Amino acid sequence: EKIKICLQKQVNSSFSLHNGFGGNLYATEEKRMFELVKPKAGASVLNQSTWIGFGDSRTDKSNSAFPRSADVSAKTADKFRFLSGGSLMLSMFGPPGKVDYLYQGCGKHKVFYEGVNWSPHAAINCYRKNWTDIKLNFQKNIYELASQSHCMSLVNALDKTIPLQVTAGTAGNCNNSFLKNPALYTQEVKPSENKCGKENLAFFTLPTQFGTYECKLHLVASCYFIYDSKEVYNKRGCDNYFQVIYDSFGKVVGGLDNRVSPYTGNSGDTPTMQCDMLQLKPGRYSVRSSPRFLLMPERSYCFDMKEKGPVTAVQSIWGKGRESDYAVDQACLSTPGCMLIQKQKPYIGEADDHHGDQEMRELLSGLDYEARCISQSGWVNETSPFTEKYLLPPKFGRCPLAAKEESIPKIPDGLLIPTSGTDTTVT
Amino acid sequence: EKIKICLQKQVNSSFSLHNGFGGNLYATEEKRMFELVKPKAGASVLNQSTWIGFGDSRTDKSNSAFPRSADVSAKTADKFRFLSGGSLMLSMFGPPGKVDYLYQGCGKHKVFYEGVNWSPHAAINCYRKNWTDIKLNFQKNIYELASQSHCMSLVNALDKTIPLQVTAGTAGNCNNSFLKNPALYTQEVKPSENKCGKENLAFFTLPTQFGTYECKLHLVASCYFIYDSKEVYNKRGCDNYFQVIYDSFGKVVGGLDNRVSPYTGNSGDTPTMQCDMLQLKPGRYSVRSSPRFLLMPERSYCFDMKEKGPVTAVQSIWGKGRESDYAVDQACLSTPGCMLIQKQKPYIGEADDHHGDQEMRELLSGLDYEARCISQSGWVNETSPFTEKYLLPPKFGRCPLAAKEESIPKIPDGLLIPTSGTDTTVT
Amino acid sequence: EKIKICLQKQVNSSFSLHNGFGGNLYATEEKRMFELVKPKAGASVLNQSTWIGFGDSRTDKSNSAFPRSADVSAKTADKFRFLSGGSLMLSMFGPPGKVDYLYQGCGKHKVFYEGVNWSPHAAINCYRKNWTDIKLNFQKNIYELASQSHCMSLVNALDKTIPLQVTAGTAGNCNNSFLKNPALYTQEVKPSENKCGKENLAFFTLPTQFGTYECKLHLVASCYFIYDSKEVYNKRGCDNYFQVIYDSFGKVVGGLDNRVSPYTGNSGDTPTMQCDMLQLKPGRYSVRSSPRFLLMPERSYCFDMKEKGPVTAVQSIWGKGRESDYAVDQACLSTPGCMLIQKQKPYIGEADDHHGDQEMRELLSGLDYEARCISQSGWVNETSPFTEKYLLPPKFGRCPLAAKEESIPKIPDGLLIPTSGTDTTVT
Amino acid sequence: IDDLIIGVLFVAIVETGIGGYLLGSRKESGGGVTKESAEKGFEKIGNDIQILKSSINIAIEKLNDRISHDEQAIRDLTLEIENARSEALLGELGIIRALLVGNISIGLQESLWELASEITNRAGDLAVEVSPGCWIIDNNICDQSCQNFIFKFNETAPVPTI
Amino acid sequence: IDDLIIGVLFVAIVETGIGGYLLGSRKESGGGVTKESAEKGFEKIGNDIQILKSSINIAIEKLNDRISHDEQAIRDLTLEIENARSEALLGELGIIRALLVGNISIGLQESLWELASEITNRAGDLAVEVSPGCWIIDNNICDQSCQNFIFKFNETAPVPTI
Amino acid sequence: IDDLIIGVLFVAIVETGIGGYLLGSRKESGGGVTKESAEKGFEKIGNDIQILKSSINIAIEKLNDRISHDEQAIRDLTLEIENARSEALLGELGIIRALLVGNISIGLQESLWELASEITNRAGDLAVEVSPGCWIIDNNICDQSCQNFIFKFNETAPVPTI
Ligand SMILES: *[C@@H]1O[C@H](CO)[C@@H](O[C@@H]2O[C@H](CO)[C@@H](O[C@@H]3O[C@H](CO)[C@@H](O)[C@H](O)[C@@H]3O)[C@H](O)[C@H]2NC(C)=O)[C@H](O)[C@H]1NC(C)=O
Ligand SMILES: *[C@@H]1O[C@H](CO)[C@@H](O[C@H]2O[C@H](CO)[C@@H](O[C@H]3O[C@H](CO)[C@@H](O)[C@H](O)[C@@H]3O)[C@H](O)[C@H]2NC(C)=O)[C@H](O)[C@H]1NC(C)=O
Ligand SMILES: *[C@@H]1O[C@H](CO)[C@@H](O[C@H]2O[C@H](CO)[C@@H](O[C@H]3O[C@H](CO)[C@@H](O)[C@H](O)[C@@H]3O)[C@H](O)[C@H]2NC(C)=O)[C@H](O)[C@H]1NC(C)=O
Ligand SMILES: *[C@@H]1O[C@H](CO)[C@@H](O[C@H]2O[C@H](CO)[C@@H](O[C@H]3O[C@H](CO)[C@@H](O)[C@H](O)[C@@H]3O)[C@H](O)[C@H]2NC(C)=O)[C@H](O)[C@H]1NC(C)=O
Ligand SMILES: *[C@H]1O[C@H](CO)[C@@H](O[C@@H]2O[C@H](CO)[C@@H](O[C@@H]3O[C@H](CO)[C@@H](O)[C@H](O)[C@@H]3O)[C@H](O)[C@H]2NC(C)=O)[C@H](O)[C@H]1NC(C)=O
């Protein structure tokens, strides 16, 4: 009778008190609003139809031992424009014997995985023993210009005019001819008998367009011979060496003039070739040089400058056995817009020692999915807005932000007991 | 008695359940938090006192048949600095007979509506048959420099010094004299009788200031004669044609040197003139050229580079009858910062066939009000933060964002019934 | 018996009604959520370990009369790299007698407080009466390059090669020798007896590195003599004056060539020296000049271009007595990235008339604390997100925003009475 | 809920029946569960609903554009950005929206409790108020007349004595 | 509402009268509507008000600056931008402000209901509690003494058993 | 608070005792304050708690990333920025979080009131309901049997006065 029943709310120690706007909650468990997200290491893209890749052989779908030799799936290989044994650099200079492939294509996002094919191993030397530096700079520009154009294509031949005294040249170091891009040309000249040739002048034209492709900017290679000194040069040459590229008006845009700059070679009696990367607007350029040699530019990569975009560059090296290089690596990391992909472990291929390495494969696997964000720190296709460590700089998309696991908000869970007003809670 | 009354909450089918933070609501109607906003097509501005326009005749307030002839209101015309028959380009080269107006003024936002006055129709030819290309580039720079300066003004005369062998020249095609900007100058020279003049050197000075106006950067035109070939040139000229503009030190800033570049003409026995747009810092420049002709720059547009700002450019064409051009259009669209205004229907004027077109009027009507935002997609003076289609790139102000009508949030309306807790709602 | 008690909520006039989400509140008092913040005038930094200063004497810790002579505390002086009587500009040209200090160091934030030491007062003249303009431009570049490099250092000597006809020169105006940077060199030449020297060619090398310091970019001074006219020049010189600096190829990067540009002097029979600021990539440059004089560059400031950062520049003037200049001020204000610090009152030092001015001290006091933000409008170490007036442009950190005191939100205070639903509130 | 004429705590969902605020009556020896609106009691709720709906307009109008001021001179497309900026602003708006609905909801219910109190405050005879919103009067003491007075409000045949 | 003295549901607006929480009493055969504060019952509300006001400080302090970090080296003016950024942050603050006021409001009222229960829980003699916050005791059984005990709380002369 | 056993208004804090929703009973001539759970009544709350917890998932998932789209090609470090951007987004999340907790809280309580009404709606014999959540029945009329029926719900040994 004189009893008393009551719906009671009782909270012990296994509690926790989450406070809220307009009433709180005691709870037995609690969990995070969002989970911290880890970046999947490797390369991926967004849109999947706005990307294109330039390939090796590890990407060459139409290669004999296919699946095996590949570092990518078929789906991916389909989006690649490769050809076994090629390299953008190889096509740039067209050295003898080495494969000359017409790389070109369009895409908002360009993925490069080429280069190994012209590593120190290639042991090419056409008046130059260590090409790496050039490789570096060449790559550096390809990436820069690539990250600002939509379309790009090798321009395998351009309108030019060579003088008559000069005649096509062949070289010992260059197997038995010469490179295709810097094109050698020479004229009989013997200083001894006091017969110095006719200083030559030759023109060349960077096109406004090349087939479908619109060229707003050309990447050409300005090359010249570096002699140790006058007398040495004067051994086979008559006055003072020089090669210069002037523009429509006599403005100079490149070269080397030993008539005002000092000789800086150190290769003894024979010169060394130096190739500078030049970005030239389209037009009619001319070059002037000392009689004996003329290194005429006859090729280039053409970029429209239509739009900005991301660039992924995969490192290209040999399995053990042959000497590789990090020009690519260096270059990617030294230019805004490209993301470098590198292996931690060495290369060991399935097809053979140099094709189909596991790591690389699980690295470039992302190219098959659509990510929410891609960074130099990796990619992520998950959805939370937070991550443990700060994603790295070149990054595109909806990238999560860094935040301590603790600092993220908590949601009440398990048993919930609503708290009332103020001193409602009495022990 | 044993009745039971109850304030009851009942909801049928004409309901809808809007849920909220801390209780929900059932409702009979619902409406959008904000309405999608359409952009008004045409041109407008913000601040109304920070803008200035450069005019034609369709803007010339002091024109005979006024209201009629205008494409703008009086209020607007007041903010314009025009003069019937003028064109920035016309003032740049001052061709014979054509009106030469001193365009100049300041403003955070510059609105250009000139040009038609030097369209193919004008049939001007001073050694050049189709001026459009030049018009294009000229416009291109005006807009660029204009979008980076606060003030700009034509510089109708600059300190110069012409050599004695040379004397003012007149031309057949140029009515019977010559342009005012590229200024012809010549000297008697007959190759036949082996009398080649004295290669000339002349100076000229881009001023640091021009009246109130401060010049941090000058737009000058570098011109030269394009010959088909040597012999042709050698018909009236002595060695090899050339005209070059050097800077304080002998650096070249422009021109054409046929002593190193090839001849590229195809106009038969008489040359063609080519005019390059050059941006020059103020200073003392010099030019050198083959004896016979000297095209001395004698005018320019001067820009301080004080501040960035928007630029609207209205297309300028003739009503039907005379030939028009799209240099303006092309140019605006090809330079960051300016917004192009174009007509869909042709021109049919009230005053006469070429002045006072309806479309244009309702297009430039916006210049009378203050917008919240202006874009290449149109302007808007309303206030919602959303719109159906993405506004186009060059845009300034508080532009609304694209969003599907559906996706915008809904507000409960009509009959509201508060829902309580959980299973409060029972069938 | 028939009474009635009620917990009543009554609100008179001393009320105010704050409305909220889910219930309102009547209150007797109210206060702002945040307080408006004033910027402390003067200079400060963030991180305190990422900054470095280049000093005078007013910063020189190792100065005789220390505390007194200083304009900064010890703590601050420690972070400075100064030396009494120095000036970056002084070290740039190394004039005779004046202190030549090797300024160099690293920091994300660089604070400059030097310059007074080469003010008009210094009355130095080495073929130039008013150096201020040069000071201006020199400072201008230091700041620019400084705000883009992490490390910078004076390069007191660089690999060069001087011809034989020429021999070290000394000058009357230049006490009795010459500047250290633009280095005079001459060769006997007497036009009268028709003995014109041998036009000279000399080389010089901007290094890629200088001790720890990496040089991605060099600031060198290109100087030359400005003659009134030929004949005047022809008084002591033979043909036409000229000094030019070419790059690896014959590209010109600077100088003056009176063989194509007009003579512009007005100092009568003796020339005037002009010094341009040049930014040069590292390499081997050459210079050519008329026989008689050769002003060879022999020093420079070297900057890596590693990273962007803030720059504070304190104005440097004399106490009353000697003539000062505003080159610094002008320069700071004219370059993005640096913040200028100026005094309102004049200089009156404690140590003596020119060292230890009160104002300056309370100005540079901030250098001792860590600010939340620094702007050209002052700094603030407080924490509210709002301020009365808009902070000035060059500013870094978490700067508060401008907002009217009123417009900031209000918090209920004093006596609080909860309002219930709708018409809950009645008379 | 409770049988078929639930209190001011629950809400009847009758896909095809009448809808709104109404008086649900039922006897213990009766199968007919009368439902009918008392447009005279509603007179409050209805007006309060207006006052409530009025607030939204204000607060909505009050949304001082968390909208950005642009100086985009460059021509490159930014849809991927504009889009994301919008998706967010949309989200921001959603929350502050729910914030409004809830407040209304709260204030409306708190306003239905205003009726009860008022209805309850209408006799010790009535004063049965079982569950909130529901009460059981005795029609032997409280004939229709006062029932109507108590609820509906016809002001005829109520309570004199005093 | 009601007569000269209402419940814990409404709030009296007397532009010039006393203000605060107080005890409104009135008899049926009386014109004098006594209003007076019971600073002993207030003792709870008052303290709770503090506790409540305390929270704001926290949550406000808690506003971890939705404030931007800048690296503005360029010198161009940005007021049109700074301004718009401010108008927004101001707006953001406003909402979270109302969020606080409402929460307080809610908790305060919920705290006024804490008194009723407590006052009601003070006798079957009192236990008249008509409308919420209002009750009608009989001074023949509940003389001032217990009235004061019931409400005000002097702890002298009341009780219904033990 | 209500002696040793309070109503649906307050919440007992017993650092080491049982925890949850339960039935607190106590007689007037008894020292033993029985506490025990009626897992049959809980059956509602428990399920509702689920329904409630369910909502969070939705609304949280619903957070359509107030996350920025970047085109950062430059290499300069931005931590001072990324950090501040994060501290803010974190803050934004916090509020919308409390927003969820409170809504839950509100709906849960409003759901506990759903029980009372339902329990109260279980006899004129019970119908003592003193304070909200608490009621005093007479075991002379309401023996354990109905007590269990009234609350717990065993469906055995009631008492219909008809
Ligand atoms: C030495 O040379 C320096 C620089 O060439 C001269 O300093 C400059 O002097 C002029 C006139 O005193 C200043 O320009 C003036 O500015 C004011 C306001 O800004 C304006 O009203 C005038 O119309 C004019 O533009 C200029 O600020 C100043 N520059 C600096 C850095 O101080 C100096 O005058 C020369 N000294 C002698 C003795 O010739
Ligand atoms: C909305 O309003 C709530 C009240 O309805 C806020 O809560 C506050 O009240 C509690 C008491 O229930 C405070 O507790 C303090 O005291 C205890 C015991 O000594 C301490 O353990 C505890 O650390 C506190 O100091 C709460 O702290 C207080 N606020 C908070 C955030 O806990 C509720 O917080 C408020 N909602 C928001 C979003 O501010
Ligand atoms: C705050 O809490 C509310 C509960 O009071 C949330 O609501 C939820 O509860 C209702 C019941 O009134 C659910 O309605 C039924 O139908 C829906 C169909 O959409 C089911 O999803 C649900 O399980 C029920 O069967 C609501 O659905 C449910 N939420 C919603 C959004 O409808 C209310 O949403 C919450 N407020 C916020 C801002 O989250
Ligand atoms: C949540 O909903 C509340 C209502 O329950 C809002 O409050 C309001 O309080 C009263 C009643 O609606 C309004 O009074 C208006 O009418 C009276 C007529 O006597 C005028 O005197 C008064 O000036 C008003 O015009 C309040 O105006 C209204 N408050 C507000 C701020 O609109 C409550 O505001 C709402 N929550 C939020 C955050 O708005
Ligand atoms: C269930 O929902 C509502 C319950 O009210 C019904 O819709 C409403 O129907 C009434 C008819 O009585 C409409 O009233 C009309 O109002 C206008 C003024 O607005 C007046 O001019 C007319 O004479 C008429 O009285 C009311 O507008 C309407 N509201 C809506 C939102 O539809 C609905 O029909 C109900 N269904 C059933 C089966 O009862």
Ligand SMILES: *[C@H]1O[C@H](CO)[C@@H](O[C@@H]2O[C@H](CO)[C@@H](O[C@@H]3O[C@H](CO)[C@@H](O)[C@H](O)[C@@H]3O)[C@H](O)[C@H]2NC(C)=O)[C@H](O)[C@H]1NC(C)=O
């Ligand atoms: C209408 O209501 C307001 C709010 O209560 C009244 O203002 C209040 O006036 C009282 C005077 O009794 C103030 O209280 C006193 O405060 C002093 C502080 O030094 C204290 O020493 C006294 O013991 C006493 O508590 C109270 O602070 C003040 N409150 C506010 C917010 O101003 C006002 O008087 C009322 N109008 C009328 C006609 O009563």
Ligand SMILES: *[C@H]1O[C@H](CO)[C@@H](O[C@@H]2O[C@H](CO)[C@@H](O[C@@H]3O[C@H](CO)[C@@H](O)[C@H](O)[C@@H]3O)[C@H](O)[C@H]2NC(C)=O)[C@H](O)[C@H]1NC(C)=O
């Ligand atoms: C006060 O905190 C909790 C209140 O629930 C008590 O711990 C609880 O202990 C029960 C078992 O007695 C746990 O049940 C678990 O899941 C099901 C029932 O839900 C049962 O079949 C399993 O065997 C299992 O025990 C309940 O989840 C658990 N909750 C927590 C947070 O520990 C705790 O014992 C209480 N303290 C005291 C002194 O009673």
